[PDB]
Amino acid sequence: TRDQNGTWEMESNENFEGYMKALDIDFCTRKIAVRCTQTKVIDQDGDNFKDKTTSTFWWWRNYDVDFTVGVEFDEYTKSLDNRHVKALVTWEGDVLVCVQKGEKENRGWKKWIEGDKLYLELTCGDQVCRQVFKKK
Amino acid sequence: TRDQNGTWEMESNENFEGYMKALDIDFCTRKIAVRCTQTKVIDQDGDNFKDKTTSTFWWWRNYDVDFTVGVEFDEYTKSLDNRHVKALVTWEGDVLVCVQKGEKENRGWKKWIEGDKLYLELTCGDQVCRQVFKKK
């Protein structure tokens, strides 16, 4: 039967990776694509077809650190590089400052509040990453 | 203010990738990481901190094509390899068959109903991908 109208949800997906490799799609895109749901909405009007396909992938991770200022603790950077560091958090004025002692030199972060904005500076080697958060 | 309690939503994120590269995080992980939302939940009691960072990643892609059976059309395969092909869709029996003429040899797909299910075969070169959909 030729009636393909409706909304369709993919149930099985065989050798998507090999077909995508044949299209020369990069490894990173392929890793996500094989994990996507796929929804195909097909509208047929005589010889006219509209085919709307949605691919979606949702991922989430929590990274929890509990510490007391001045009490060195061991941190395992599970959300980044998977390293063990000895972290020490101190105050410098209203700035929370952390040295992460380990394999990487000059590794740490700084965290402070101005009104409804939280600023976070992450340091490793010669690289500084600056992040701004708003209050929710 | 030294009171960092609350829920904070990242609104700006500068040089996250250079910082992650210094941490030797692989390309791709970095590419995924920089596309993440970041939420920071801080439960603070004096010098005692609980810090939860929630990273969510939401990959979403829509691909919509309109075509007429037998009428060649220009396709820009933006949901996969971002290539331009001359696509022609025909009926072969009850199978909807498409040939995508372009850089890639033996590129196309086939679409048909068996029982309750939509079947889709994607071919490129010697690679065939088979997808089965249920009706929703």
PDB file of C-alpha atoms in Angstrom:
ATOM      1  CA  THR A   1       0.000   0.000   0.000  1.00  0.00           C
ATOM      2  CA  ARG A   2       1.068   3.485  -1.075  1.00  0.00           C
ATOM      3  CA  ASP A   3      -0.604   5.498   1.726  1.00  0.00           C
ATOM      4  CA  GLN A   4       2.324   6.784   3.798  1.00  0.00           C
ATOM      5  CA  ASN A   5       0.408   9.617   5.517  1.00  0.00           C
ATOM      6  CA  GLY A   6       0.749  10.064   9.229  1.00  0.00           C
ATOM      7  CA  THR A   7       3.236  10.558  12.032  1.00  0.00           C
ATOM      8  CA  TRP A   8       5.932   7.940  12.356  1.00  0.00           C
ATOM      9  CA  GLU A   9       8.368   7.183  15.149  1.00  0.00           C
ATOM     10  CA  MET A  10      11.542   5.238  14.368  1.00  0.00           C
ATOM     11  CA  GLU A  11      11.668   1.887  16.188  1.00  0.00           C
ATOM     12  CA  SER A  12      14.809   0.345  14.694  1.00  0.00           C
ATOM     13  CA  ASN A  13      17.884   1.738  13.017  1.00  0.00           C
ATOM     14  CA  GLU A  14      20.361  -0.643  11.416  1.00  0.00           C
ATOM     15  CA  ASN A  15      23.777   0.425  10.064  1.00  0.00           C
ATOM     16  CA  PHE A  16      23.049   4.130  10.373  1.00  0.00           C
ATOM     17  CA  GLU A  17      26.756   4.540  11.199  1.00  0.00           C
ATOM     18  CA  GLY A  18      28.017   2.884   8.022  1.00  0.00           C
ATOM     19  CA  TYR A  19      25.690   4.920   5.822  1.00  0.00           C
ATOM     20  CA  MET A  20      26.799   8.103   7.587  1.00  0.00           C
ATOM     21  CA  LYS A  21      30.443   7.106   7.163  1.00  0.00           C
ATOM     22  CA  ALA A  22      29.755   6.699   3.445  1.00  0.00           C
ATOM     23  CA  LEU A  23      28.483  10.273   3.444  1.00  0.00           C
ATOM     24  CA  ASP A  24      31.825  11.299   5.054  1.00  0.00           C
ATOM     25  CA  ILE A  25      29.989  12.731   8.083  1.00  0.00           C
ATOM     26  CA  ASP A  26      32.437  13.524  10.861  1.00  0.00           C
ATOM     27  CA  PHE A  27      32.789  11.164  13.816  1.00  0.00           C
ATOM     28  CA  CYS A  28      31.407  13.682  16.303  1.00  0.00           C
ATOM     29  CA  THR A  29      28.190  14.339  14.373  1.00  0.00           C
ATOM     30  CA  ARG A  30      27.796  10.558  13.871  1.00  0.00           C
ATOM     31  CA  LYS A  31      28.094   9.835  17.577  1.00  0.00           C
ATOM     32  CA  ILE A  32      25.095  12.060  18.297  1.00  0.00           C
ATOM     33  CA  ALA A  33      23.057  11.160  15.218  1.00  0.00           C
ATOM     34  CA  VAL A  34      22.930   7.416  15.918  1.00  0.00           C
ATOM     35  CA  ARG A  35      21.500   8.276  19.373  1.00  0.00           C
ATOM     36  CA  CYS A  36      18.700  10.521  18.090  1.00  0.00           C
ATOM     37  CA  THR A  37      15.056   9.711  18.058  1.00  0.00           C
ATOM     38  CA  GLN A  38      13.548  10.252  14.647  1.00  0.00           C
ATOM     39  CA  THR A  39      10.035  11.401  13.914  1.00  0.00           C
ATOM     40  CA  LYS A  40       8.805  11.611  10.336  1.00  0.00           C
ATOM     41  CA  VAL A  41       5.569  13.478   9.564  1.00  0.00           C
ATOM     42  CA  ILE A  42       4.363  12.645   6.037  1.00  0.00           C
ATOM     43  CA  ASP A  43       1.614  14.617   4.265  1.00  0.00           C
ATOM     44  CA  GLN A  44       0.592  13.313   0.846  1.00  0.00           C
ATOM     45  CA  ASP A  45      -1.666  15.232  -1.553  1.00  0.00           C
ATOM     46  CA  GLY A  46      -1.949  13.416  -4.875  1.00  0.00           C
ATOM     47  CA  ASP A  47       1.578  13.291  -6.300  1.00  0.00           C
ATOM     48  CA  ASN A  48       2.703  15.916  -3.772  1.00  0.00           C
ATOM     49  CA  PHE A  49       4.591  14.901  -0.641  1.00  0.00           C
ATOM     50  CA  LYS A  50       5.688  16.873   2.377  1.00  0.00           C
ATOM     51  CA  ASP A  51       8.086  14.935   4.601  1.00  0.00           C
ATOM     52  CA  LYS A  52       9.126  16.630   7.859  1.00  0.00           C
ATOM     53  CA  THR A  53      11.716  14.699   9.856  1.00  0.00           C
ATOM     54  CA  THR A  54      12.804  15.653  13.373  1.00  0.00           C
ATOM     55  CA  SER A  55      15.955  14.242  14.991  1.00  0.00           C
ATOM     56  CA  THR A  56      16.451  14.925  18.709  1.00  0.00           C
ATOM     57  CA  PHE A  57      18.939  13.914  21.402  1.00  0.00           C
ATOM     58  CA  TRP A  58      18.758  15.097  25.030  1.00  0.00           C
ATOM     59  CA  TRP A  59      21.648  14.653  27.466  1.00  0.00           C
ATOM     60  CA  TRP A  60      22.156  15.903  31.004  1.00  0.00           C
ATOM     61  CA  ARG A  61      24.816  15.547  33.708  1.00  0.00           C
ATOM     62  CA  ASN A  62      25.044  16.734  37.319  1.00  0.00           C
ATOM     63  CA  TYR A  63      28.437  17.552  38.817  1.00  0.00           C
ATOM     64  CA  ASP A  64      28.388  17.977  42.611  1.00  0.00           C
ATOM     65  CA  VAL A  65      31.108  19.402  44.824  1.00  0.00           C
ATOM     66  CA  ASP A  66      30.681  19.836  48.581  1.00  0.00           C
ATOM     67  CA  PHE A  67      33.397  21.626  50.547  1.00  0.00           C
ATOM     68  CA  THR A  68      34.232  23.895  53.452  1.00  0.00           C
ATOM     69  CA  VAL A  69      36.370  26.997  52.959  1.00  0.00           C
ATOM     70  CA  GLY A  70      39.880  26.228  54.175  1.00  0.00           C
ATOM     71  CA  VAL A  71      39.460  22.444  54.199  1.00  0.00           C
ATOM     72  CA  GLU A  72      41.439  20.889  51.377  1.00  0.00           C
ATOM     73  CA  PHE A  73      39.512  18.088  49.694  1.00  0.00           C
ATOM     74  CA  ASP A  74      40.036  15.666  46.856  1.00  0.00           C
ATOM     75  CA  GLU A  75      38.097  16.463  43.723  1.00  0.00           C
ATOM     76  CA  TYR A  76      37.582  14.123  40.764  1.00  0.00           C
ATOM     77  CA  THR A  77      36.806  16.234  37.698  1.00  0.00           C
ATOM     78  CA  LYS A  78      34.203  13.841  36.296  1.00  0.00           C
ATOM     79  CA  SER A  79      32.502  16.599  34.230  1.00  0.00           C
ATOM     80  CA  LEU A  80      35.707  17.744  32.505  1.00  0.00           C
ATOM     81  CA  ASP A  81      39.010  15.916  32.254  1.00  0.00           C
ATOM     82  CA  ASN A  82      38.551  13.038  34.793  1.00  0.00           C
ATOM     83  CA  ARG A  83      41.506  14.049  36.962  1.00  0.00           C
ATOM     84  CA  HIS A  84      42.174  13.913  40.682  1.00  0.00           C
ATOM     85  CA  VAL A  85      43.150  17.280  42.103  1.00  0.00           C
ATOM     86  CA  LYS A  86      43.610  18.545  45.654  1.00  0.00           C
ATOM     87  CA  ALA A  87      41.288  21.521  45.862  1.00  0.00           C
ATOM     88  CA  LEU A  88      41.594  24.269  48.438  1.00  0.00           C
ATOM     89  CA  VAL A  89      39.011  27.035  48.581  1.00  0.00           C
ATOM     90  CA  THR A  90      39.821  30.338  50.274  1.00  0.00           C
ATOM     91  CA  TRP A  91      38.263  33.759  50.479  1.00  0.00           C
ATOM     92  CA  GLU A  92      39.941  36.820  48.948  1.00  0.00           C
ATOM     93  CA  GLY A  93      37.566  39.576  49.903  1.00  0.00           C
ATOM     94  CA  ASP A  94      34.221  38.500  48.538  1.00  0.00           C
ATOM     95  CA  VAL A  95      35.924  36.254  45.953  1.00  0.00           C
ATOM     96  CA  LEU A  96      35.838  32.502  46.475  1.00  0.00           C
ATOM     97  CA  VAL A  97      39.227  31.266  45.187  1.00  0.00           C
ATOM     98  CA  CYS A  98      40.213  27.647  44.574  1.00  0.00           C
ATOM     99  CA  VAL A  99      43.605  26.152  43.815  1.00  0.00           C
ATOM    100  CA  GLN A 100      43.341  22.667  42.255  1.00  0.00           C
ATOM    101  CA  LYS A 101      46.713  21.047  42.885  1.00  0.00           C
ATOM    102  CA  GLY A 102      47.559  18.374  40.358  1.00  0.00           C
ATOM    103  CA  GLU A 103      49.089  17.448  37.035  1.00  0.00           C
ATOM    104  CA  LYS A 104      48.057  20.737  35.373  1.00  0.00           C
ATOM    105  CA  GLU A 105      49.954  23.837  36.440  1.00  0.00           C
ATOM    106  CA  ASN A 106      48.094  27.001  37.372  1.00  0.00           C
ATOM    107  CA  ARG A 107      44.737  25.254  37.662  1.00  0.00           C
ATOM    108  CA  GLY A 108      41.918  26.761  39.655  1.00  0.00           C
ATOM    109  CA  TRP A 109      38.876  28.923  39.590  1.00  0.00           C
ATOM    110  CA  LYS A 110      37.386  32.067  41.095  1.00  0.00           C
ATOM    111  CA  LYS A 111      33.729  32.755  41.849  1.00  0.00           C
ATOM    112  CA  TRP A 112      32.007  35.925  43.057  1.00  0.00           C
ATOM    113  CA  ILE A 113      28.655  37.740  43.145  1.00  0.00           C
ATOM    114  CA  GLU A 114      27.624  41.174  41.911  1.00  0.00           C
ATOM    115  CA  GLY A 115      23.894  41.681  42.407  1.00  0.00           C
ATOM    116  CA  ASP A 116      22.031  39.188  40.270  1.00  0.00           C
ATOM    117  CA  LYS A 117      25.139  38.036  38.414  1.00  0.00           C
ATOM    118  CA  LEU A 118      27.622  35.346  39.379  1.00  0.00           C
ATOM    119  CA  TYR A 119      31.062  35.482  37.691  1.00  0.00           C
ATOM    120  CA  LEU A 120      33.240  32.398  37.336  1.00  0.00           C
ATOM    121  CA  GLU A 121      36.811  32.405  36.046  1.00  0.00           C
ATOM    122  CA  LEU A 122      38.353  28.998  35.351  1.00  0.00           C
ATOM    123  CA  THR A 123      42.133  28.855  34.894  1.00  0.00           C
ATOM    124  CA  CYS A 124      44.379  26.161  33.494  1.00  0.00           C
ATOM    125  CA  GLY A 125      47.864  26.919  32.190  1.00  0.00           C
ATOM    126  CA  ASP A 126      47.700  29.937  29.892  1.00  0.00           C
ATOM    127  CA  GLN A 127      43.934  29.558  29.299  1.00  0.00           C
ATOM    128  CA  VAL A 128      41.276  31.562  31.188  1.00  0.00           C
ATOM    129  CA  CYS A 129      37.572  30.797  30.731  1.00  0.00           C
ATOM    130  CA  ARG A 130      35.139  33.467  31.871  1.00  0.00           C
ATOM    131  CA  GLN A 131      31.502  32.690  32.553  1.00  0.00           C
ATOM    132  CA  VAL A 132      28.660  34.903  33.712  1.00  0.00           C
ATOM    133  CA  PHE A 133      25.517  33.499  35.381  1.00  0.00           C
ATOM    134  CA  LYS A 134      22.215  35.274  36.032  1.00  0.00           C
ATOM    135  CA  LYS A 135      20.030  34.540  39.033  1.00  0.00           C
ATOM    136  CA  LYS A 136      16.900  32.437  38.370  1.00  0.00           C
TER     137      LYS A 136
ATOM    138  CA  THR B   1      28.035  39.861  48.774  1.00  0.00           C
ATOM    139  CA  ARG B   2      29.490  36.596  50.143  1.00  0.00           C
ATOM    140  CA  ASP B   3      26.051  34.896  50.041  1.00  0.00           C
ATOM    141  CA  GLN B   4      26.070  32.792  46.857  1.00  0.00           C
ATOM    142  CA  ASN B   5      22.896  30.780  47.600  1.00  0.00           C
ATOM    143  CA  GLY B   6      20.460  30.246  44.800  1.00  0.00           C
ATOM    144  CA  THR B   7      20.063  28.952  41.290  1.00  0.00           C
ATOM    145  CA  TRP B   8      22.199  30.520  38.556  1.00  0.00           C
ATOM    146  CA  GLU B   9      21.841  30.159  34.778  1.00  0.00           C
ATOM    147  CA  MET B  10      24.860  30.645  32.527  1.00  0.00           C
ATOM    148  CA  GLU B  11      24.345  33.509  30.122  1.00  0.00           C
ATOM    149  CA  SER B  12      27.907  34.052  28.887  1.00  0.00           C
ATOM    150  CA  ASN B  13      30.708  31.573  28.311  1.00  0.00           C
ATOM    151  CA  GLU B  14      34.007  32.885  26.918  1.00  0.00           C
ATOM    152  CA  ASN B  15      36.953  30.656  25.878  1.00  0.00           C
ATOM    153  CA  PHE B  16      35.421  27.508  27.392  1.00  0.00           C
ATOM    154  CA  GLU B  17      36.990  25.592  24.486  1.00  0.00           C
ATOM    155  CA  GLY B  18      40.543  26.899  25.003  1.00  0.00           C
ATOM    156  CA  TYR B  19      40.265  26.103  28.712  1.00  0.00           C
ATOM    157  CA  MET B  20      39.035  22.592  27.916  1.00  0.00           C
ATOM    158  CA  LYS B  21      41.799  22.102  25.339  1.00  0.00           C
ATOM    159  CA  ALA B  22      44.370  22.935  28.018  1.00  0.00           C
ATOM    160  CA  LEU B  23      42.732  20.189  30.089  1.00  0.00           C
ATOM    161  CA  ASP B  24      43.434  17.829  27.141  1.00  0.00           C
ATOM    162  CA  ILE B  25      39.723  17.237  26.634  1.00  0.00           C
ATOM    163  CA  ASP B  26      39.195  15.737  23.210  1.00  0.00           C
ATOM    164  CA  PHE B  27      37.709  17.655  20.309  1.00  0.00           C
ATOM    165  CA  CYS B  28      34.036  16.633  20.027  1.00  0.00           C
ATOM    166  CA  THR B  29      33.673  16.387  23.793  1.00  0.00           C
ATOM    167  CA  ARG B  30      34.583  20.083  23.788  1.00  0.00           C
ATOM    168  CA  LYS B  31      32.213  20.704  20.843  1.00  0.00           C
ATOM    169  CA  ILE B  32      29.425  19.031  22.787  1.00  0.00           C
ATOM    170  CA  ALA B  33      30.422  20.777  26.009  1.00  0.00           C
ATOM    171  CA  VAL B  34      30.308  24.323  24.605  1.00  0.00           C
ATOM    172  CA  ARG B  35      26.740  23.708  23.329  1.00  0.00           C
ATOM    173  CA  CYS B  36      25.571  22.769  26.842  1.00  0.00           C
ATOM    174  CA  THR B  37      23.425  24.877  29.079  1.00  0.00           C
ATOM    175  CA  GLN B  38      24.824  25.193  32.568  1.00  0.00           C
ATOM    176  CA  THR B  39      22.869  25.618  35.791  1.00  0.00           C
ATOM    177  CA  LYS B  40      24.538  26.121  39.141  1.00  0.00           C
ATOM    178  CA  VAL B  41      22.625  25.379  42.352  1.00  0.00           C
ATOM    179  CA  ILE B  42      24.416  26.636  45.443  1.00  0.00           C
ATOM    180  CA  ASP B  43      23.362  25.645  48.957  1.00  0.00           C
ATOM    181  CA  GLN B  44      25.583  27.670  51.271  1.00  0.00           C
ATOM    182  CA  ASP B  45      25.820  27.683  55.081  1.00  0.00           C
ATOM    183  CA  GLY B  46      28.553  30.067  56.207  1.00  0.00           C
ATOM    184  CA  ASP B  47      31.794  28.564  54.908  1.00  0.00           C
ATOM    185  CA  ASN B  48      30.073  25.303  53.979  1.00  0.00           C
ATOM    186  CA  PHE B  49      29.177  24.889  50.316  1.00  0.00           C
ATOM    187  CA  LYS B  50      27.180  22.441  48.258  1.00  0.00           C
ATOM    188  CA  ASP B  51      27.584  23.248  44.556  1.00  0.00           C
ATOM    189  CA  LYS B  52      25.615  21.388  41.909  1.00  0.00           C
ATOM    190  CA  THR B  53      26.340  22.137  38.258  1.00  0.00           C
ATOM    191  CA  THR B  54      23.776  20.789  35.785  1.00  0.00           C
ATOM    192  CA  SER B  55      24.833  20.598  32.144  1.00  0.00           C
ATOM    193  CA  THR B  56      22.066  19.936  29.651  1.00  0.00           C
ATOM    194  CA  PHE B  57      22.584  19.302  25.951  1.00  0.00           C
ATOM    195  CA  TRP B  58      19.672  19.428  23.577  1.00  0.00           C
ATOM    196  CA  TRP B  59      20.444  18.463  19.974  1.00  0.00           C
ATOM    197  CA  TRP B  60      17.515  19.130  17.701  1.00  0.00           C
ATOM    198  CA  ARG B  61      17.366  19.104  13.939  1.00  0.00           C
ATOM    199  CA  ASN B  62      14.433  19.458  11.518  1.00  0.00           C
ATOM    200  CA  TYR B  63      14.604  18.421   7.862  1.00  0.00           C
ATOM    201  CA  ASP B  64      11.603  19.294   5.663  1.00  0.00           C
ATOM    202  CA  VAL B  65      11.359  18.395   1.964  1.00  0.00           C
ATOM    203  CA  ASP B  66       8.512  19.003  -0.512  1.00  0.00           C
ATOM    204  CA  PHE B  67       8.549  17.058  -3.744  1.00  0.00           C
ATOM    205  CA  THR B  68       6.350  15.793  -6.545  1.00  0.00           C
ATOM    206  CA  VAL B  69       6.614  12.249  -7.852  1.00  0.00           C
ATOM    207  CA  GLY B  70       8.483  12.342 -11.152  1.00  0.00           C
ATOM    208  CA  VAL B  71       9.568  16.000 -10.873  1.00  0.00           C
ATOM    209  CA  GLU B  72      13.303  16.424 -10.302  1.00  0.00           C
ATOM    210  CA  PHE B  73      14.192  18.804  -7.486  1.00  0.00           C
ATOM    211  CA  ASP B  74      17.223  20.342  -5.827  1.00  0.00           C
ATOM    212  CA  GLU B  75      17.962  18.898  -2.406  1.00  0.00           C
ATOM    213  CA  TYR B  76      20.320  20.397   0.167  1.00  0.00           C
ATOM    214  CA  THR B  77      20.935  17.546   2.620  1.00  0.00           C
ATOM    215  CA  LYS B  78      21.357  19.885   5.556  1.00  0.00           C
ATOM    216  CA  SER B  79      20.399  17.319   8.197  1.00  0.00           C
ATOM    217  CA  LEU B  80      23.243  14.975   7.107  1.00  0.00           C
ATOM    218  CA  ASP B  81      26.161  15.881   4.790  1.00  0.00           C
ATOM    219  CA  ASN B  82      25.119  19.390   3.627  1.00  0.00           C
ATOM    220  CA  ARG B  83      25.468  18.490  -0.061  1.00  0.00           C
ATOM    221  CA  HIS B  84      23.470  19.515  -3.120  1.00  0.00           C
ATOM    222  CA  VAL B  85      21.913  16.673  -5.120  1.00  0.00           C
ATOM    223  CA  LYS B  86      19.469  16.381  -7.986  1.00  0.00           C
ATOM    224  CA  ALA B  87      16.745  14.244  -6.419  1.00  0.00           C
ATOM    225  CA  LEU B  88      14.094  12.351  -8.387  1.00  0.00           C
ATOM    226  CA  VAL B  89      11.328  10.358  -6.662  1.00  0.00           C
ATOM    227  CA  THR B  90       9.327   7.673  -8.483  1.00  0.00           C
ATOM    228  CA  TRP B  91       7.001   4.782  -7.701  1.00  0.00           C
ATOM    229  CA  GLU B  92       8.414   1.313  -8.327  1.00  0.00           C
ATOM    230  CA  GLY B  93       5.545  -0.960  -7.449  1.00  0.00           C
ATOM    231  CA  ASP B  94       4.302   0.338  -4.090  1.00  0.00           C
ATOM    232  CA  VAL B  95       7.814   1.455  -3.134  1.00  0.00           C
ATOM    233  CA  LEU B  96       8.656   5.145  -3.169  1.00  0.00           C
ATOM    234  CA  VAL B  97      12.157   5.310  -4.675  1.00  0.00           C
ATOM    235  CA  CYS B  98      14.444   8.339  -4.787  1.00  0.00           C
ATOM    236  CA  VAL B  99      17.700   8.770  -6.666  1.00  0.00           C
ATOM    237  CA  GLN B 100      19.983  11.526  -5.424  1.00  0.00           C
ATOM    238  CA  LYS B 101      22.355  12.359  -8.264  1.00  0.00           C
ATOM    239  CA  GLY B 102      25.436  14.174  -7.033  1.00  0.00           C
ATOM    240  CA  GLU B 103      29.017  13.744  -5.895  1.00  0.00           C
ATOM    241  CA  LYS B 104      28.231  10.445  -4.167  1.00  0.00           C
ATOM    242  CA  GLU B 105      27.841   7.294  -6.243  1.00  0.00           C
ATOM    243  CA  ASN B 106      24.760   5.076  -5.816  1.00  0.00           C
ATOM    244  CA  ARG B 107      23.015   7.504  -3.446  1.00  0.00           C
ATOM    245  CA  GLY B 108      19.322   7.299  -2.706  1.00  0.00           C
ATOM    246  CA  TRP B 109      16.532   5.920  -0.601  1.00  0.00           C
ATOM    247  CA  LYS B 110      13.422   3.754  -0.731  1.00  0.00           C
ATOM    248  CA  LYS B 111      10.275   4.082   1.334  1.00  0.00           C
ATOM    249  CA  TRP B 112       7.426   1.618   1.684  1.00  0.00           C
ATOM    250  CA  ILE B 113       4.718   0.263   3.965  1.00  0.00           C
ATOM    251  CA  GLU B 114       4.695  -3.333   5.190  1.00  0.00           C
ATOM    252  CA  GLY B 115       1.754  -4.121   7.402  1.00  0.00           C
ATOM    253  CA  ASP B 116       1.612  -1.499  10.126  1.00  0.00           C
ATOM    254  CA  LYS B 117       5.087  -0.102   9.560  1.00  0.00           C
ATOM    255  CA  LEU B 118       6.989   2.425   7.452  1.00  0.00           C
ATOM    256  CA  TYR B 119      10.273   1.094   6.066  1.00  0.00           C
ATOM    257  CA  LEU B 120      13.090   3.361   4.901  1.00  0.00           C
ATOM    258  CA  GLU B 121      16.294   2.205   3.267  1.00  0.00           C
ATOM    259  CA  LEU B 122      19.057   4.740   2.815  1.00  0.00           C
ATOM    260  CA  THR B 123      21.806   3.758   0.383  1.00  0.00           C
ATOM    261  CA  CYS B 124      25.123   5.416  -0.359  1.00  0.00           C
ATOM    262  CA  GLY B 125      27.741   3.442  -2.262  1.00  0.00           C
ATOM    263  CA  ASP B 126      27.830  -0.040  -0.742  1.00  0.00           C
ATOM    264  CA  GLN B 127      26.301   1.064   2.573  1.00  0.00           C
ATOM    265  CA  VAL B 128      22.611   0.481   3.244  1.00  0.00           C
ATOM    266  CA  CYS B 129      20.881   1.750   6.390  1.00  0.00           C
ATOM    267  CA  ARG B 130      17.489   0.309   7.295  1.00  0.00           C
ATOM    268  CA  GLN B 131      15.021   2.132   9.519  1.00  0.00           C
ATOM    269  CA  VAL B 132      11.615   0.952  10.695  1.00  0.00           C
ATOM    270  CA  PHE B 133       8.965   3.312  12.022  1.00  0.00           C
ATOM    271  CA  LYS B 134       5.718   2.643  13.949  1.00  0.00           C
ATOM    272  CA  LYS B 135       2.586   4.734  13.401  1.00  0.00           C
ATOM    273  CA  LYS B 136       1.738   7.362  16.045  1.00  0.00           C
TER     274      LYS B 136
END
